[PDB]
């Protein structure tokens, strides 16, 4: 992924449109992948980075949404790619006029597949009153997503934060999975961040974390992050956090085994016994 | 209301250089997208040559990369192509566009016809 | 670089037809094109980006959807205003690569 | 050891064999001599026993 943060391509932030629907084996996350630009998080984040580390890829499908009375492409000024762009998954639902009204909507999906969706939405907490005016329009605001095993009615928080690299407010993307034939409607009048694509999987794969190279010549199976682990030896004293198929962590270094009888140089009592040292001038035989 | 008008000579002599401009009106240069320049073969067949930035940084077609140069003028809000060592197949019609993010291009000028033989 | 092979280089259509035009990327863009249509006349137009939606101020009779390394628009219930030729763009790795062009037909 | 304030969700759901409404059943613990209030202006399913 390099400069791909793992949990991103379900979303498409720039650094990532090149992995937007990839296939993998052995996916890798660098140390420096992101994943966002504007500033915000998901929500039990390390959870779903165990869902995506075996599933193989990712396959994304539309889900045809369409919208009136209402802009769809406010941008924002930090997921740059030659401007002012939003990411490639979603899209910034915001008002016409721009403090006059704001329609209350509603929308639907039903999945039609064999496999189960992961569908995220956005939430956007406005920096204050004035720029909730200003973007959206009047009154309180609500997000309601409800399916069958599943519903929430959530609601920003119009607040003033630090500032991450320009910017305070803050958006929270959650995500839901939908069953076959299943159905998931969102309701709302302001500060929403749709999804338009859905996400389904693949197959089976390996995660592991590293710092160094991607190598292509050898032969492997033990992978933690500084290397690779390569032996027919049971044990290996190398890294207790080492995935894949690997020996088994001890944390003796050194444990010799005997391939020899005794070494007596010039249970039962010949060997350092009855017969007294060993031979050196016998060079075939025991 | 972003409108992209070219402009330049008629006939070109071979082995010389090519300068030519395109006018923005509506909207700032330095506003930030990136402004293109875009040939068209004879046979209609399309060809994209480099862009300068809003804040002035270029990048160019890697087979045109020791022969070509684009700069901008922030007062009368245009920008110059500039184009040397030219031989016979360089007569195209020539295309000044604002491009949009790497999703796409928006915005077309309506092109102009150059020459270039003795 | 990358190769857009346009596909087929000509083919005649009457009123009310419904018609389809392939791209075919020769490497993985998997989600990145555009259609123009600029026919010899006129300005260009824009018709559709990020292989699905549609540009604001096109009549809603026009259509595409694609991703991967396939990608293919819809057009039927055709108009005098709607001869022209349609380029698509990729726009994964630079340099930009434009397709051979089509050109619309009257059977 | 428990404060909630629980509130409805007035929306429309897709249909389980006829019915699109929810309900949605909380539970606590008591221990002995401890005490429970329930107060509510709508939308309440008491228990009994």
């Known amino acids: 992924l390099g400069q791909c943060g793992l949990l991103g391509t379900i979303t498409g932030p720039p650094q990532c449109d090149q992995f937007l629907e990839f296939s993998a084996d052995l996916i890798i996350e660098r140390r420096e992948g992101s994943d966002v630009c504007y500033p915000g998080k998901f929500v039990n984040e390390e959870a779903l980075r165990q869902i995506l580390r075996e599933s193989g890829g990712i396959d994304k499908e539309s889900m045809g949404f369409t919208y009136n009375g209402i802009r769809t492409n406010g941008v924002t000024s930090a997921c740059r790619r030659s401007g002012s762009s939003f990411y490639a998954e979603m899209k910034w639902l915001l008002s016409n006029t721009d403090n006059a009204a704001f329609p209350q909507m509603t929308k639907s999906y039903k999945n039609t597949r064999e496999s189960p969706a992961i569908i995220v939405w956005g939430i956007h907490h406005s920096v204050s009153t004035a720029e909730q005016t200003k973007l959206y329009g009047s009154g309180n605001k609500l997000v309601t997503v409800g399916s069958s095993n599943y519903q929430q009615s959530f609601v920003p928080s119009p607040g003033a934060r630090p500032q991450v690299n320009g910017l305070s407010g803050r958006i929270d993307f959650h995500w839901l999975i939908l069953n076959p034939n299943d159905t998931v409607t969102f309701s709302f009048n302001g500060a929403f961040i749709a999804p338009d694509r859905a996400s389904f999987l693949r197959g089976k794969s390996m995660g592991i974390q590293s710092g160094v190279q991607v190598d292509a010549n050898c032969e492997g199976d033990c992978y933690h992050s500084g290397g690779t682990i390569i032996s027919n030896l049971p044990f290996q004293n190398i890294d207790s956090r080492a995935v894949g198929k690997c020996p088994r962590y001890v944390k003796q270094r050194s444990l010799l085994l005997a391939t020899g009888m005794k070494n007596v140089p010039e249970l039962f009592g010949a060997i350092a016994g009855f017969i007294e040292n060993g031979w050196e001038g016998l060079i075939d035989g025991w | 209301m972003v409108q992209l008008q070219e402009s330049g000579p008629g006939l070109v002599k071979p082995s010389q250089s090519l300068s030519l401009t395109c006018t923005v009106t509506?909207?700032?240069?330095?506003?930030?997208?990136?402004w293109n320049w875009i040939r068209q073969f004879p046979g209609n067949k399309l060809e994209w040559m480099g862009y300068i930035s809003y804040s002035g940084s270029t990048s160019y077609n890697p087979s045109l990369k020791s022969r070509m140069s684009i700069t901008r003028d922030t007062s009368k809000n245009q920008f110059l192509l500039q184009l040397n060592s030219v031989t016979t197949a360089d007569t195209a019609t020539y295309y000044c566009?604002?491009?949009?993010?790497?999703?796409?291009?928006?915005?077309w000028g309506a092109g102009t016809t150059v020459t270039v033989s003795s | 670089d990358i190769q857009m092979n346009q596909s087929p280089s000509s083919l005649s259509a009457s009123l009310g037809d419904t018609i389809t035009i392939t791209c075919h990327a020769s490497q993985t863009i998997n989600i990145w094109l555009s259609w123009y249509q600029l026919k010899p006349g006129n300005i260009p137009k824009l018709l559709i980006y990020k292989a699905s939606n549609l540009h604001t101020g096109v009549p809603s009779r026009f259509s595409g959807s694609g991703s991967g390394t396939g990608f293919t628009l819809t057009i039927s219930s055709l108009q005098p205003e709607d001869i022209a030729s349609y380029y698509c763009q990729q726009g994964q790795s630079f340099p930009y690569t434009f397709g051979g062009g089509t050109k619309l037909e009257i059977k | 050891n428990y404060q909630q304030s629980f509130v409805p969700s007035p929306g429309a759901r897709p249909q389980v064999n006829g019915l699109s409404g929810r309900i949605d059943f909380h539970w606590l613990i008591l221990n002995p001599n401890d005490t429970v209030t329930f107060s509510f202006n709508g939308a309440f399913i008491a228990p009994d026993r």
């Open positions: 509506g909207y700032s240069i330095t506003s930030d997208y990136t």
């Open positions: 566009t604002r491009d949009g993010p790497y999703w796409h291009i928006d915005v």
